[PDB]
Design an enzyme around this catalytic site. Structure first.
Site, short mmCIF file in Angstrom:
data_model
loop_
_atom_site.label_atom_id
_atom_site.label_comp_id
_atom_site.label_asym_id
_atom_site.label_seq_id
_atom_site.Cartn_x
_atom_site.Cartn_y
_atom_site.Cartn_z
N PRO A 1 -2.70 -48.30 -15.24
CA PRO A 1 -1.69 -47.98 -16.26
C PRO A 1 -2.21 -47.20 -17.44
O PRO A 1 -1.46 -46.42 -18.04
CB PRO A 1 -1.15 -49.36 -16.69
CG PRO A 1 -2.24 -50.32 -16.32
CD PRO A 1 -2.86 -49.76 -15.07
N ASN B 1 0.47 -37.71 -2.64
CA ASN B 1 1.40 -36.85 -1.91
C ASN B 1 2.01 -37.54 -0.70
O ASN B 1 2.18 -36.93 0.36
CB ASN B 1 0.73 -35.56 -1.44
CG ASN B 1 -0.02 -34.84 -2.54
OD1 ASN B 1 0.46 -34.72 -3.66
ND2 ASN B 1 -1.19 -34.33 -2.20
N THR C 1 12.39 -24.60 -22.08
CA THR C 1 13.38 -25.67 -22.00
C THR C 1 14.26 -25.56 -20.77
O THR C 1 14.90 -26.54 -20.39
CB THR C 1 14.28 -25.65 -23.24
OG1 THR C 1 14.67 -24.29 -23.54
CG2 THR C 1 13.58 -26.26 -24.44
N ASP D 1 3.69 -41.34 -15.38
CA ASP D 1 3.90 -41.03 -16.79
C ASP D 1 4.70 -39.76 -17.01
O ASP D 1 5.52 -39.70 -17.92
CB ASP D 1 2.55 -40.89 -17.49
CG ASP D 1 1.81 -42.19 -17.56
OD1 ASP D 1 2.06 -42.96 -18.52
OD2 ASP D 1 1.01 -42.48 -16.64
N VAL E 1 -4.23 -44.87 -17.70
CA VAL E 1 -4.49 -43.44 -17.77
C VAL E 1 -3.21 -42.65 -17.54
O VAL E 1 -2.12 -43.10 -17.91
CB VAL E 1 -5.59 -43.01 -16.78
CG1 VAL E 1 -6.90 -43.69 -17.13
CG2 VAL E 1 -5.17 -43.33 -15.35
N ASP F 1 -14.05 -33.15 -8.60
CA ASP F 1 -13.42 -32.53 -7.44
C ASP F 1 -14.49 -32.02 -6.48
O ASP F 1 -15.56 -32.62 -6.37
CB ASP F 1 -12.48 -31.41 -7.92
CG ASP F 1 -11.30 -31.18 -6.98
OD1 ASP F 1 -11.52 -31.09 -5.76
OD2 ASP F 1 -10.15 -31.10 -7.48
N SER G 1 -2.07 -32.64 -6.81
CA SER G 1 -3.34 -32.13 -7.32
C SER G 1 -3.17 -30.86 -8.14
O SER G 1 -4.07 -30.52 -8.92
CB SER G 1 -4.28 -31.81 -6.16
OG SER G 1 -4.75 -33.00 -5.56
N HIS H 1 -10.64 -26.38 -3.40
CA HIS H 1 -9.69 -27.24 -4.12
C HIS H 1 -10.08 -27.39 -5.58
O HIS H 1 -9.24 -27.27 -6.47
CB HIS H 1 -9.67 -28.58 -3.37
CG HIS H 1 -8.72 -29.59 -3.92
ND1 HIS H 1 -9.08 -30.49 -4.89
CD2 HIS H 1 -7.46 -29.92 -3.55
CE1 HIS H 1 -8.07 -31.30 -5.14
NE2 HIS H 1 -7.07 -30.98 -4.34
CA LIG Z 1 -0.27 -44.37 -19.49
#
Ligand SMILES: [Ca+2]
Lengths: 6, 279
Positions: B175, B161, B16, B200, B177, B39, B224, B69
């Site tokens: 939206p 980025n 927290t 999100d 995802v 990837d 990433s 990566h």
């Molecule tokens: Ca969403």
């Protein structure tokens, strides 16, 4: 179009 | 369970407050859940994967990660030391070349592969797909991400980025995802993190230690790196029965730490991923 690592 | 002297971001997702270095998690650890990492590939031989990572698909002359990566992102999902969900299975989908580049047609091909392939795997508790890549806006890339989510996969995506509005990037701007922004060890928005109403959730993204190629480890930064924290957290929560693929992004936002971060622009959610674990 080309995507890339972020 | 408690992993002492953990990399900071694992500690952050079970806390927290900033300023702790112990990861606290339920021992189930994502067992019976699966995560695809779309990837540059995964070095499946790496000691830290403990025989739980494999390469299932490539679109190049080899399935090996020559970039690193993909292996790093896989490590934050599921490596024994550096990963959120230490007992998850890890599938590798090589859509990016060893320079980190990929045509949009190849990326879409890898997404539709996941939606089908999952039906050929043993993942009774859940299926996530981590997508630590993006580029210029495209409705067709967004639709592939939507289709994957609609098939019953939780799709986490990096916001990008560019310190820019994520509405102009794909699949960040889809939206349906889960769109992931990056934070730093002092609970600031990372100075590279895209923002905006399509985000999100934030996860740790600056100075994230994880696995690299050659059996090594290193720290790097990016949205990433945040995205696999959230993909691993979803797998962990599905194994516990708290949420499902179609509901995990919403579940994560609802249970997140709220109002912790700084450098949040007006119009962007102040929500940091949290596993809610109480020993
Ligand atoms: Ca969403």
């Amino acid at each position: 179009a080309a995507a890339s690592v972020k | 369970a408690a992993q002492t002297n953990a990399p900071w971001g694992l500690a952050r997702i079970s806390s927290t407050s900033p300023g702790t270095s112990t990861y606290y998690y339920d021992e189930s650890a994502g067992q019976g859940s699966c995560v695809y990492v779309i990837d540059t590939g995964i070095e499946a031989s790496h000691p830290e994967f403990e025989g739980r990572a494999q390469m299932v698909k490539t679109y190049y002359y080899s399935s090996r990660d020559g970039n690193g990566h993909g292996t790093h992102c896989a490590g934050t999902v599921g490596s024994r030391t550096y990963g959120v969900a230490k007992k998850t299975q890890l599938f590798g989908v090589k859509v990016l070349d060893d320079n980190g580049s990929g045509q949009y047609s190849t990326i879409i091909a890898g997404m539709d592969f996941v939606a089908s392939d999952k039906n050929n795997r043993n993942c009774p508790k859940g299926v996530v797909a981590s997508l630590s890549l993006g580029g210029g806006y495209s409705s067709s890339v967004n639709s592939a991400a939507a289709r994957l989510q609609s098939s019953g996969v939780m799709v986490a995506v990096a916001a990008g980025n560019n310190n820019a509005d994520a509405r102009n990037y794909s699949p960040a701007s889809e939206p349906s995802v889960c769109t992931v922004g990056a934070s730093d060890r002092y609970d600031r928005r990372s100075s590279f993190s895209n923002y905006g109403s399509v985000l999100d959730i934030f996860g740790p993204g600056t100075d994230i230690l994880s696995t690299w190629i050659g059996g090594s480890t290193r720290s790097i930064s990016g949205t990433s790196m945040a995205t696999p924290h959230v993909a691993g957290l979803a797998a962990y929560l599905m194994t516990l029965g708290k949420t499902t693929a179609a509901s995990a992004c919403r579940y994560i936002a609802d249970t997140a730490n709220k109002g912790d971060l700084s450098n949040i622009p007006f119009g962007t959610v102040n929500l940091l991923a949290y596993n809610n674990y109480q020993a």
